[PDB]
Coordinates of C-alpha atoms and ligand atoms in Angstrom, one line a residue:
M15 CA -0.3 -0.2 0.0
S16 CA 1.6 3.2 -0.9
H17 CA 1.7 6.4 0.6
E18 CA -1.5 7.8 -1.7
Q19 CA -2.9 4.9 -1.4
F20 CA -2.8 5.3 2.4
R21 CA -3.9 8.7 2.3
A22 CA -6.8 7.9 0.0
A23 CA -8.0 4.8 1.9
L24 CA -7.7 6.9 5.0
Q25 CA -9.8 9.9 3.3
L26 CA -12.3 7.2 2.6
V27 CA -13.1 6.4 6.4
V28 CA -12.6 9.3 8.5
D29 CA -14.9 12.0 8.9
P30 CA -14.6 14.9 5.8
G31 CA -14.5 18.4 7.0
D32 CA -11.7 20.1 8.9
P33 CA -12.4 19.7 13.0
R34 CA -10.8 23.3 12.8
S35 CA -14.2 24.2 12.0
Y36 CA -15.5 23.3 15.4
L37 CA -12.6 23.1 17.4
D38 CA -10.6 25.7 19.3
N39 CA -7.5 26.4 21.4
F40 CA -5.6 23.3 20.8
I41 CA -2.8 22.8 23.4
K42 CA -0.4 20.4 23.3
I43 CA 0.1 18.1 26.3
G44 CA 2.2 15.4 25.6
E45 CA 2.9 12.9 22.1
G46 CA 3.1 9.1 21.4
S47 CA 4.9 6.5 19.5
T48 CA 4.3 8.4 16.3
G49 CA 2.7 11.6 16.5
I50 CA 1.3 14.1 19.6
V51 CA -2.1 14.6 21.6
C52 CA -3.2 17.9 22.4
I53 CA -6.0 19.0 24.5
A54 CA -9.1 21.2 22.6
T55 CA -12.4 22.6 23.0
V56 CA -15.4 22.3 21.2
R57 CA -16.8 25.6 20.3
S58 CA -20.7 24.9 20.5
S59 CA -20.5 22.8 23.5
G60 CA -17.2 24.5 25.4
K61 CA -16.9 20.9 26.1
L62 CA -12.9 19.5 26.0
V63 CA -11.8 16.7 24.3
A64 CA -8.1 15.2 23.2
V65 CA -6.4 15.1 19.9
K66 CA -4.1 12.6 18.4
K67 CA -2.0 14.1 15.7
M68 CA -0.5 11.2 13.8
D69 CA 2.4 11.7 11.4
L70 CA 1.7 9.6 8.2
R71 CA 4.7 9.8 7.2
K72 CA 6.5 8.2 10.6
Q73 CA 3.9 5.1 10.2
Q74 CA 6.0 1.9 10.0
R75 CA 2.8 -0.2 9.1
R76 CA 0.3 2.2 7.8
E77 CA -2.1 -1.0 7.2
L78 CA -2.4 -0.6 11.6
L79 CA -3.8 2.7 11.5
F80 CA -6.4 2.0 9.2
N81 CA -7.4 -1.6 11.0
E82 CA -7.4 1.2 14.1
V83 CA -9.8 3.9 12.7
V84 CA -12.1 1.0 10.8
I85 CA -12.7 -1.1 13.8
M86 CA -12.8 1.3 17.0
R87 CA -14.4 4.5 15.2
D88 CA -17.7 3.5 16.6
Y89 CA -17.1 1.4 19.4
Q90 CA -18.8 1.6 22.6
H91 CA -17.9 -0.1 25.9
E92 CA -17.6 1.5 29.7
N93 CA -13.8 0.0 29.7
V94 CA -12.7 1.3 26.3
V95 CA -11.4 4.9 25.4
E96 CA -14.1 6.5 23.1
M97 CA -13.3 7.8 20.1
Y98 CA -15.0 10.7 18.5
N99 CA -13.9 11.4 15.0
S100 CA -11.2 11.6 13.0
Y101 CA -9.8 13.8 9.9
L102 CA -7.2 13.6 7.1
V103 CA -5.3 17.1 7.2
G104 CA -2.7 16.8 4.8
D105 CA 0.4 14.2 6.4
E106 CA -1.4 14.1 9.3
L107 CA -4.3 11.8 10.6
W108 CA -6.6 13.9 13.8
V109 CA -8.3 11.6 16.1
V110 CA -11.0 13.1 18.3
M111 CA -11.4 11.2 21.7
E112 CA -12.4 11.8 25.2
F113 CA -10.4 13.3 27.7
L114 CA -9.3 11.0 30.9
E115 CA -8.4 13.1 33.6
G116 CA -6.6 10.7 35.5
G117 CA -4.3 9.8 33.0
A118 CA -2.2 6.5 32.3
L119 CA -1.2 3.6 34.6
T120 CA 2.3 3.9 34.0
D121 CA 3.0 7.0 35.9
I122 CA 0.9 5.1 39.0
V123 CA 3.2 1.6 38.8
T124 CA 6.3 4.1 38.8
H125 CA 5.6 6.1 41.6
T126 CA 3.9 4.0 43.9
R127 CA 2.9 0.8 45.1
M128 CA -1.0 -0.1 44.6
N129 CA -2.5 -2.7 46.8
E130 CA -4.5 -5.5 46.0
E131 CA -8.1 -3.7 45.3
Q132 CA -6.7 -1.7 43.3
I133 CA -5.2 -3.9 41.2
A134 CA -8.1 -6.1 41.3
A135 CA -10.0 -3.3 40.3
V136 CA -7.7 -2.6 36.9
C137 CA -7.4 -5.9 36.3
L138 CA -11.5 -6.7 36.1
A139 CA -11.9 -3.4 34.1
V140 CA -9.7 -4.5 31.4
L141 CA -10.7 -8.2 31.4
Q142 CA -14.1 -7.1 31.2
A143 CA -13.2 -4.7 27.9
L144 CA -11.4 -7.9 26.6
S145 CA -13.9 -10.6 27.1
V146 CA -16.0 -8.6 24.8
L147 CA -13.8 -7.3 22.2
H148 CA -12.4 -11.2 22.1
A149 CA -15.6 -12.6 21.6
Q150 CA -15.8 -10.1 18.8
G151 CA -12.5 -11.3 17.1
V152 CA -10.8 -7.9 17.9
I153 CA -7.3 -8.4 19.4
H154 CA -5.7 -4.9 21.0
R155 CA -1.9 -6.5 21.0
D156 CA -0.7 -3.8 22.9
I157 CA -2.1 -4.2 26.5
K158 CA 0.9 -2.4 28.9
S159 CA 0.3 0.2 31.9
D160 CA 0.8 3.2 29.3
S161 CA -2.6 1.4 27.3
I162 CA -4.2 2.1 30.4
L163 CA -6.2 5.3 31.2
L164 CA -8.0 6.6 33.8
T165 CA -10.9 8.8 34.6
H166 CA -11.0 11.6 36.8
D167 CA -13.2 9.7 39.1
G168 CA -11.5 6.3 38.8
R169 CA -12.7 4.5 36.1
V170 CA -10.5 2.2 34.1
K171 CA -10.4 1.9 30.2
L172 CA -8.2 0.6 27.4
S173 CA -6.9 3.2 24.9
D174 CA -3.8 2.9 22.4
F175 CA -5.9 0.3 19.8
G176 CA -3.1 1.2 16.8
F177 CA -1.5 -2.8 16.4
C178 CA -5.1 -4.4 17.0
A179 CA -6.1 -7.1 14.6
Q180 CA -9.6 -8.9 13.7
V181 CA -9.7 -12.7 13.6
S182 CA -12.6 -14.8 12.2
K183 CA -13.5 -18.5 11.5
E184 CA -12.0 -17.8 8.1
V185 CA -9.0 -16.2 9.7
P186 CA -8.6 -17.1 13.5
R187 CA -4.9 -16.4 14.1
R188 CA -2.5 -13.5 13.2
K189 CA 1.3 -13.8 12.4
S190 CA 2.3 -10.7 12.9
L191 CA 5.2 -9.2 15.3
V192 CA 3.3 -6.3 16.6
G193 CA 3.1 -5.0 20.1
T194 CA 5.6 -3.8 23.2
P195 CA 9.2 -6.0 23.5
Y196 CA 8.2 -6.6 27.4
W197 CA 5.3 -6.9 27.0
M198 CA 4.7 -9.7 23.7
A199 CA 3.4 -13.2 24.3
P200 CA 5.9 -16.0 23.9
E201 CA 4.4 -17.6 20.7
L202 CA 4.2 -14.5 18.8
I203 CA 7.6 -13.5 19.7
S204 CA 8.3 -16.9 17.8
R205 CA 6.3 -15.6 14.8
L206 CA 3.7 -18.7 15.4
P207 CA 0.1 -18.2 14.3
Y208 CA -1.4 -16.8 17.6
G209 CA -5.1 -15.6 18.7
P210 CA -6.3 -12.7 21.8
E211 CA -5.0 -15.7 23.9
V212 CA -1.3 -12.8 23.7
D213 CA -3.2 -10.1 25.2
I214 CA -4.0 -12.1 28.5
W215 CA -0.1 -12.9 28.4
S216 CA 0.3 -9.3 27.9
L217 CA -2.1 -8.8 31.1
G218 CA -0.3 -10.7 33.4
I219 CA 3.2 -8.8 32.5
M220 CA 1.2 -5.7 33.4
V221 CA 0.1 -7.3 36.7
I222 CA 3.7 -7.1 37.4
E223 CA 3.9 -3.6 36.5
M224 CA 1.8 -3.0 39.2
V225 CA 3.2 -5.4 41.8
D226 CA 6.9 -4.9 41.1
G227 CA 6.6 -1.4 39.3
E228 CA 8.3 -2.8 35.8
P229 CA 8.1 -5.4 33.6
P230 CA 10.6 -8.3 33.4
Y231 CA 13.9 -7.7 31.9
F232 CA 13.2 -4.3 31.9
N233 CA 17.0 -4.1 32.7
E234 CA 17.7 -5.5 29.2
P235 CA 17.3 -4.0 25.7
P236 CA 14.1 -4.4 24.1
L237 CA 15.5 -7.0 21.6
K238 CA 17.3 -9.0 24.4
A239 CA 14.1 -9.3 26.4
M240 CA 12.4 -10.6 23.5
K241 CA 14.8 -13.1 23.0
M242 CA 14.5 -13.9 26.9
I243 CA 10.8 -14.1 26.8
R244 CA 11.1 -16.7 23.9
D245 CA 13.1 -19.0 25.0
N246 CA 13.3 -18.6 28.7
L247 CA 10.5 -20.3 31.7
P248 CA 8.0 -17.5 32.5
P249 CA 8.9 -14.1 34.2
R250 CA 8.8 -13.8 38.1
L251 CA 8.0 -11.5 40.6
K252 CA 10.7 -9.4 42.8
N253 CA 8.0 -8.4 44.9
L254 CA 6.5 -12.1 45.3
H255 CA 6.2 -12.4 48.8
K256 CA 4.5 -9.3 49.3
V257 CA 1.5 -10.6 47.3
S258 CA -1.0 -12.8 48.2
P259 CA -2.1 -15.9 47.0
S260 CA -5.1 -15.6 45.3
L261 CA -3.0 -12.3 43.3
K262 CA -0.3 -15.2 42.7
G263 CA -3.0 -17.5 41.7
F264 CA -4.9 -15.5 39.3
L265 CA -1.0 -14.3 37.7
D266 CA -0.3 -18.1 37.2
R267 CA -3.2 -18.5 35.1
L268 CA -2.2 -15.4 32.9
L269 CA 1.7 -16.4 32.4
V270 CA 1.3 -19.4 30.5
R271 CA 3.6 -20.2 27.9
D272 CA 1.8 -22.7 25.9
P273 CA -1.8 -20.5 24.8
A274 CA -3.6 -23.4 24.5
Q275 CA -3.3 -23.6 28.8
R276 CA -3.4 -20.1 29.5
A277 CA -6.5 -18.5 30.6
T278 CA -9.0 -16.6 28.9
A279 CA -11.0 -13.5 29.5
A280 CA -14.2 -15.3 30.2
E281 CA -12.6 -17.2 32.9
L282 CA -10.8 -14.8 34.5
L283 CA -13.5 -12.7 35.1
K284 CA -14.6 -15.4 37.8
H285 CA -11.2 -15.8 39.3
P286 CA -11.9 -14.9 43.2
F287 CA -8.7 -12.5 43.0
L288 CA -11.4 -10.0 41.2
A289 CA -13.5 -10.4 43.8
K290 CA -11.4 -8.1 45.9
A291 CA -11.8 -5.2 43.7
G292 CA -12.6 -1.8 45.0
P293 CA -14.6 0.8 43.4
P294 CA -13.4 3.4 41.0
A295 CA -12.6 5.8 44.4
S296 CA -10.5 3.9 45.8
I297 CA -7.9 4.4 42.3
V298 CA -8.5 8.2 42.7
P299 CA -5.8 8.5 45.7
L300 CA -3.4 6.8 43.1
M301 CA -3.4 9.9 40.6
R302 CA -0.4 12.5 40.3
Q303 CA -2.7 15.1 41.0
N304 CA -4.2 13.1 44.4
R305 CA -1.0 11.4 45.3
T306 CA 1.5 12.5 48.6
Ligands
LIG407 C1 1.1 6.0 25.0 N1 -0.1 6.7 25.1 C2 -1.1 6.7 26.0 C3 -2.7 7.1 25.4 N2 -2.6 8.3 24.4 C4 -3.8 9.1 23.8 O1 -3.6 8.4 23.3 N3 -4.2 9.8 24.4 C5 -4.0 10.4 26.3 C6 -5.1 10.4 26.3 C7 -6.0 10.6 25.5 N4 -7.5 10.8 26.2 N5 -7.2 11.5 27.6 C8 -6.2 11.4 27.6 N6 -5.3 11.9 28.6 C9 -4.0 12.0 29.0 O2 -3.0 11.7 28.1 C10 -3.2 12.3 30.8 C11 -4.3 13.0 31.4 C12 -4.1 13.6 32.5 C13 -2.4 13.2 33.1 C14 -1.8 12.3 32.3 O3 -0.2 12.2 31.8 C15 0.8 12.9 32.9 C16 1.5 12.2 33.9 C17 2.7 12.8 34.6 C18 2.8 14.0 34.3 C19 2.1 14.5 33.8 C20 0.9 14.0 33.2 C21 -2.2 12.6 30.6 C22 -6.0 10.0 24.7 C23 -5.8 10.8 23.0 C24 -6.5 9.1 24.3 C25 -1.3 7.9 23.5 C26 -1.6 9.5 22.4 C27 -0.5 9.2 21.1 C28 -0.6 7.7 20.6 C29 0.0 7.7 19.4 C30 0.5 8.7 18.4 C31 0.9 10.1 19.2 C32 0.0 10.2 20.6 C33 -0.2 7.7 24.1

């Protein structure tokens, strides 16, 4: 797919018109894997939203970007970040999405230690989203703390579907090497046909993040960690004894090398560990703006 076929295809699935017609005061707040993030205001209502501006000339696999807009444009789930509109502006894809005040889980796991009630709440939210997604044949493929956002009141939402893929009866598996090194499933690194189960492994790594503050082999270069993940026995927790038997049991069902033996999102939703989940209000204290 050439650059022009890409822009054209993109132009075909994005909203027509210029967002500058109803969006004001754009203000950069950060950036991502291939662009920047800004906050803006909807003219008519004064409602604040977040805008993801992506550089089309920096997309490694531009097919994946197309998949993100097509598959998730109208997606609606309480634990999934909502996309309002998308626009093709020159050589940039602008995606207008909801603004989540709580930030990403990354900032939390790297500056504080969550209790088990907070961890269960996060796992539960992510698992509710994945169970619905997986049932529809949608695989996220980039589960990690960075992909998890929080609302001001503590609700958990899955975002960053930039690496997502679709499977079906006709095409039950994918083989693309995608995701983030430290969180990649061993079967995916091995380049073996894989399915939704890879999200479950990545989630397990995110659990290690919540307990330890970082994923396994985080002290190793990405390509080296990938080799270790693919060839070594499942990773272990540094703060092993600081977690309960319930959390350890839960984790053991996530980090199973053989995907056929790994638990599924649906099965995990009934695991005793998630019964400890606290309400959204328990997540609030974790946010940077509220941490001491
Ligand atoms: C690694 N990814 C995380 C998700 N991002 C998003 O796509 N975001 C972030 C975001 C959104 N809505 N509301 C927020 N809130 C904050 O970002 C948000 C809110 C409050 C606090 C905060 O952190 C902070 C943490 C420490 C210090 C200061 C701030 C972040 C959307 C547009 C969905 C990705 C962007 C992207 C991807 C690809 C290409 C270009 C851009 C990057």
